[PDB]
């Protein structure tokens, strides 16, 4: 009837309850899921998902990892994920600010590295926080 | 008087690879060697 | 041998080696100054 | 509109437009240079620090191209490169038009292509010398090492780096300032400005090209 | 009459030919070096240069069929 | 008469072919503007920059067909 | 007579011409803009801007062949 | 006469040559403009608009071809 | 006579031309449109709908080659 | 004679060129086709509906050249 | 005389460039129809019923033209 | 004279056009037809039977071009 | 005279032509061959008999292009 | 005179395209051919075999196009 | 009178073909020469100096066609 | 006089058309033989002797273009 | 006189054709060799000297075509 | 008269056409050559021997067009 979906995290499994459609960021850019899906292999950039079943869609963002999507069912495989909601949007941008913070400061081949991929990191919480 | 006729191959060939030689000499102990 | 005078052959010249000299000045002076700057550093 | 020129006689003909026009280059180069090279000073003064940079930048490239003995060729990829970078902006920038000859328009050296073969054969004789001076009298680089039956494609080769590196200059500052001039006849001095600095920016880059393909002959004969 | 006429054509295909191939070739010259910039913003000052320096190179080409049309047309020594 | 006929057709094909290389070339490099402003949208300002300015450097391609068969037509020497 | 003759069919040909490479270049480019957005939706806003600047560089390359043909055709100076 | 017989084939031509590039234009956007959709359904209606915009762009340059092909037959004014 | 000769070529090659292109697009753009289907069957009804309405944008373009063709076969105001 | 002698062959080039490039067309599209099935075969049943309609589509192009072919052939107005 | 000599050419090229479009068409097609039997074997009675369904669709495209290839040399009206 | 010697090479290009397409058709399709045998031999059974059928579909297309050759160089109705 | 003539070089063409699209065919086809051979040498006896089996379809092709040109230059008979 | 001239031409054109195809067919195949060694050193001899019988195939394409060539300019029964 | 004729053209076609190729040929390495730019900006240095180098290398090549352009129209030996 | 300035020509294009295939085909098959050489040092001994044998085999391609030309301009027999 | 004329032209094709290949040739090769040294800049040495010693094997074949045409300027043994 | 004048010719489009194929090539072929040189610089000396190799045998293709065109224009047993 519909394709069913279980993102998992290295310790927990966050979502397995299944829905009519996603919607998720990946290294190309965008892509969309609807059910009977061709299977498909994508590695998914960290940035938000967007899920809709039924009446109700809501982002959690999640930080990267692959993503591949079988016959009526998706699995996706991301380091961390949150949901956009239990989030609380102002703490997220403060972190997102320390984070930007600290940045424009780093400096050093590697530093900025960890500098670049933590305020990556940030600027998609609240972008799940408002959403 | 005679129009134009360029693309000619004479001697003045000759001539400035030796004025261009000179200058190259020359102009390497003035300018380049001090 | 004679000279040739018109003034077509070198008002165009005129502007480009001005440019040149004065953005070349410019840019030149201020890298060999730069150098000479860390030379003595 | 005119390809014509006119010679001088010491009972040859040569022409006179090209040794005046290459006399403004080398009286132009020694007399900067020979200001330049007055008073140094330890820390780079005013004026002398673009000479110094203009070396820095012929000495780089010859070692590159040449290697760890680039430091005797210096002065001739030196001169290669200022002959004829002053050559395409002594004739882009001065002006010459003014001037009237008595039968031929004077802007570089360089148009005639007298010059440019003489340039090529003077990198030609370099490399040679390169070539007969540091390896085997017996052989240089011409050799059949590889392939006893690459010998046509090698010998012909020969004859080609002098004929293209001699025709590319050659061509394309003769072919820029017809630009210039064609340019000229249809229409008013305003509106081929930016062709002159497209034809400016490349007056310096076939100069430098040369230079550098002229320094990465000595390095085939080295090996 | 014909020499002129001639003249004429081959300042036609002179122009038509010579923005054939560079016509092409700077286009996927510069939508390569739009593509890099989007992968990496801070890279645009470096890519810009190489980019503009590119097309100076590829733009000429058809400069040279533009002024031998001209040459054709205006300053034709035939005619 | 002869003339005049030559210089028409040369008029035809100098445009008619000058658009051949640009317009396939203009095509790839928007098109992979675009791809490139859809996967950074924060990128726009600066990919549209280059954009536009490599357009015109393509643009320009059929300028030069487009100025000589006007040259042709209009302000014929040869006629 | 023939200079009518002539200039007809200079008149074809410049449009025929010009509809070549454009025709293909705003295709790709239109194509890989609509790609971008089906990857992309809410950046809908920053494709469209450019991808409709970029029909209209491309699509004057066939104007240039379209004028010409009319201006052959109708405001025809050498009949 | 022979003002009329080569109106009529600039008339063939104009529009047989016009559909060529655009006809393989139109081709590849929709074609993308549809796997796009088949990868994002959600995103039919933000795809849809920019496909139809496209092709009244792509569709226009055979309309050239087409109207002077017109004017070649009809509205003649050579004959 | 010569015209009439001239104008049935011109209906030949009208008609002979237009499908070249088209011809190629909508291919390129249904079997794109199909591989979506057979990833995304639930977008089937979807995807019908843009690859439909594409190819009818494409269809015309020979159908402007098929018009003229006629108009110079039967409709021939030359003859 | 004359006039029929180019109508026979207008009627040749005229089908002569309009399988080209559908011929091309229908090949990717249905070979895309089969290759999605393949990968679907639940989905056969959705997909052979539309690259059947597809084809009929891609079909016809060299049906009007077909046409124009017989229009030259049997029912001639112009002999 | 020449009718005849105009006919039998036109009833060369008609198949000769006929099979030009198809025979690269049906190429890919199949070919791309047995990599897919080879993905899934147990899917080739799926698979080839699309596939022969494919081909007559592209075998056509080339009887158009053997056909009017024999009604030129065989049931010639003009002759 | 004339019909005969417009017959002979009617019969010399239609052979020669005929194999263009299919000879490139038959070859993609054969070749992925091994490669997908090669990666799945235990299907070779089930490659080969729509390799086999699919050649025969292609090579009949440059029968067409044969008989025609052929009905022009020996059972030739026009001389 | 001129019916010799005309045949010898059709004779040329057939032969010159037949082997365009056929000698790229094979050689798609045999490489990729190989390529699967390379990757599972164990299928070697497998891809051999397809393999062969497709150059002997491809290769007749230019067999029907070369026994025109024979029965073109030796059994001709319009000379 | 004629005949032999026209045979000279025949003779030329037909080993000069044979070469066309089969040149670049030949050049694919051994390619991949080697590439195919490079990752599996020890399938060489397999590997070999085929790619050697291939060429043969290939090969021939081209001998057909320089037989006819030695039968036009030697064994000539035309002159 | 003729001899200038023909001189005239061959120095519109000297150029005109000229820059097809490397036309091409810079914008492919130039654009892939950015590509790695945006990819490695540390590497600024060392790719520019290729590619620089590489275009004089291309450049050139339409010299050749420039220089003997203008041999042909200016210091022409023949008239 | 026409026999020999047609067999000259002929001489011409046999040895230019020649080069045309497999100037490419050796190209792509060298390149990817290197490549291949680059990924497996080791198997240069194994990589190489296919390699040489390859060109060989599309080498003579444009030797049998070559001994055409030259049968046609010195050991001509029809002059 | 004709002699002249038909020489002037060989001289432009010459050069005309000679810069097509090689000048797509060099782009490719130095523009993949860019790449390689922004992928590994500390290979750049090892890079640079292949990429100079193929542009000068790449720039010879445009040199025949430049040394012919010069031969046909200048020094002519014809006129 | 005719006899040098086609001579001249032949002797202009041997070295002309001979360069189109090798020039491309010879660049596919150095450039893959260097790509490999990137990525292992410790098999330079592999490599080089290979890519100078290949460019002989690709060098000599242009060769038999360059000699073939000297034999046209100096040693021409025919004039």
């Known amino acids: 009837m519909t394709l069913n979906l279980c993102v998992l995290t290295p310790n927990r499994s966050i979502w397995n309850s299944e829905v009519k459609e996603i919607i998720l960021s990946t ?39 692959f993503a591949r999507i079988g016959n009526n069912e998706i699995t996706i495989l991301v380091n961390d994920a949150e949901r956009g909601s239990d989030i609380d949007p102002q703490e997220a941008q403060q972190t997102l600010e320390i984070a930007e913070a600290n940045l424009r400061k780093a400096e050093g081949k590697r530093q900025k590295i960890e500098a670049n991929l933590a305020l990556r990191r940030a600027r998609t919480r609240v972008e799940a926080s408002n959403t | 008087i005679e129009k134009a006729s360029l693309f000619d191959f004479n001697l003045t060939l000759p001539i400035i690879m030796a004025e261009f030689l000179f200058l190259m000499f020359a102009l390497d102990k003035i300018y380049y060697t001090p | 041998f004679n000279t040739d005078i018109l003034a077509t052959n070198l008002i165009n010249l005129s502007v480009v080696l001005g440019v040149l000299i004065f953005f070349g000045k410019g840019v030149l002076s201020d890298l060999l100054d730069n150098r000479k700057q860390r030379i003595l550093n | ?35 330049a090279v007055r008073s140094p000073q330890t820390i780079p003064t005013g004026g002398q620090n673009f000479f110094e940079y203009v070396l820095e930048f012929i000495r780089d490239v010859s070692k590159t191209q040449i290697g760890e003995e680039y430091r005797p060729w210096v002065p001739f990829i030196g001169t290669m490169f200022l002959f004829i970078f002053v050559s395409n ?34 990198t030609s004789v370099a490399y040679f010398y390169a070539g007969l001076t540091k390896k085997g009298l017996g052989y240089f680089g011409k050799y059949i090492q590889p392939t006893p039956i690459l010998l046509p494609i090698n010998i012909l080769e020969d004859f080609t780096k002098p004929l293209s590196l001699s025709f590319r200059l050659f061509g394309n500052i003769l072919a820029d300032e017809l630009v210039v001039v064609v340019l000229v006849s249809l229409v008013p001095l305003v509106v081929p400005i930016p062709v002159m600095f497209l034809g400016l920016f490349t007056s310096g880059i076939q100069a430098l090209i040369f230079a550098t393909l002229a320094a990465a002959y000595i390095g085939e004969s080295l090996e | 009459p014909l020499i ?45 240069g190489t980019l503009l320096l590119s097309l100076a190179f590829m733009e000429a080409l058809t400069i040279y069929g533009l002024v031998v049309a001209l040459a054709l047309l205006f300053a034709n020594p035939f005619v």
């Open chain 5, 4 to 48: 002129a006429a001639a003249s004429v054509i081959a300042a036609g295909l002179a122009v038509g030919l010579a923005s054939i191939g560079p016509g092409v070739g700077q286009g996927t010259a510069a939508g390569q070096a739009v593509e890099g910039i989007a992968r990496q913003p801070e890279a645009e000052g470096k890519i810009r």
């Open chain 4, 1 to 35: 509109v005119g390809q014509h020129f006119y010679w001088q006689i010491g009972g040859f003909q040569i022409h006179g437009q090209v040794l005046i026009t290459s006399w403004v280059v080398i009286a132009i180069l020694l007399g900067s240079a020979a200001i």
């Open chain 4, 89 to 122: 902006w002594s004739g882009a920038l001065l002006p010459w038009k003014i001037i009237q000859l008595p039968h031929g328009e004077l802007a570089a050296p360089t148009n005639d292509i007298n010059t440019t073969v003489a340039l090529a054969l003077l």
């Open chain 1, 27 to 65: 290294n190309s850019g965008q892509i969309g899921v609807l059910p009977n899906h061709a299977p498909t292999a994508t590695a998914v950039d960290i940035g938000i998902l967007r899920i809709r079943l039924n009446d109700q869609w809501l982002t959690l963002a999640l930080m990267g990892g």
